[PDB]
């Protein structure tokens, strides 16, 4: 099973579950943050995500007279040791909700074991390199008394707080010369900027027809489902199958589509449901061939890899087997690996269709939109998810004990006014 560690924000760095980490995009800069290992290979760093931004973006800040513009700021978020501990406790709760079902637990399980390949396209086929931003992050072994000393460690995902726009959660991969290991079959450390209190709002549902408007109503989203959505992106990224830039233009507005503006393929598969039906098999088959070709490169690499210069302490054979398991490659009598179409298709299918937003919501009794094709509406600020009188690990918002377990009354804005606010 998957263990979800526990900790208070003020605990002491133990060089194991609590450390000072140099995030991927700060490699070799000497900048460390306090990182908490919520599970093996997954870390939480309650800090704003400032990479690519300037300390001016973080607060266009209005105040007197302001109602939307769809984007939302709060230069103050995460600005105290306590807020950090809140965020930290909130995430832990979400993960625990995630883990409350075998389906979510399996997702996490797959994320933890999806170790990134030791290297990228820049690495020689006969080599294993661990000295790169997408394979490791430095931990600060040296005491608090200056003189920096560091140890490089393996990681899989790093969840930071939000960037300038709070309602803009995103999963991020590492590119060098605009080539993404997380897109070339290697896999690489994934990162995310997440904000659990500000949740989306939707009304594209009740896809039932045969009587005027196919039902309206207004519901907000379940933070845990929102998070799992991103976690699906993370999974694709660690296996290196994150679809590369590929916009999908719908050729017809079907009953479940509220909107009609093109969406990224990556989003259509992650969402699942009926969304990838909007993708032409032409295109759909090419993505598949795409993955295959990439793994063909990984398998070849593992048959030629012979050493790890970056680290003489790595048993090439050991890891050479872990990846065999990761990618489901079969071994022959020569000790050489190859791809089994039968098993390869089970993996692809599981990675591309086993975990989707639709079937997860469906399995968790969570109410979500009818398609990724939906209008964006003002998000809302959940008062306090750490209050089982409003949000629980088992049922989330639709709490049976509060008579909110029916028709997702727990998620209906008109019904559960008490759990949220209107931000501004
Ligand atoms: Zn997404």
UniProtKB/Swiss-Prot annotation:
Positions with a binding annotation for Zn(2+): 229, 233, 267
Residue numbers annotated as active site: 230
Protein's cellular compartments: Secreted; Host cytoplasm, Host cytosol
Top-level taxon of the source organism: Bacteria
Record remark on domains: Has protease activity.
Function: Has proteolytic activity. After translocation into the eukaryotic host cytosol, inhibits neurotransmitter release by acting as a zinc endopeptidase that cleaves the '76-Gln-|-Phe-77' bond of synaptobrevin-2/VAMP2, blocking neurotransmitter release. In vitro the LC only has protease activity after reduction.
Protein name as catalogued: Botulinum neurotoxin B light chain
